Amino acid sequence: GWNKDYKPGPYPQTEKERLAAAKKYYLLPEEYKPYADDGLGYGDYPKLGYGLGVEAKDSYYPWDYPEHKRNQHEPISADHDLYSEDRWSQAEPPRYSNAYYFACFLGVMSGCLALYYWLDDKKMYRPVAAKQYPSPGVKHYTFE
């Protein structure tokens, strides 16, 4: 009943180890899908849904745990923090791509900075002279 008892094991090279790992994680064999054999990749742990976060999952389904949107004995995804409901999740898929949003924002920004800083020395002015302040060395005159 500790971390040494329930833990991910070695990678399922054979099919019977894949079936035993699928039955171990309370997952049907077809659903189970391990990670890659690279250095970073986990061994024997299931690869859950990385498509979209917890907000994409059905909130009208009767869950055992309404928080985290999961049932009992369901394997938690490995990047459950990144794909949580709090951070980097959307209830509906986004209308546009990721680069269109930033492209429009920096396009409008580049146009506004360019058109402002081109016109920085074409400020208008009233038909008015410089403001005359009294000095003991320089005197000014009226018009009467």
Binding site: D64, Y65, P66, E67, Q72, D86
Partner: peptide
Amino acid sequence: SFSQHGKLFSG
């Protein structure tokens, strides 16, 4: 925020 706010842990 995550320990002290939100829905309660069921079970």
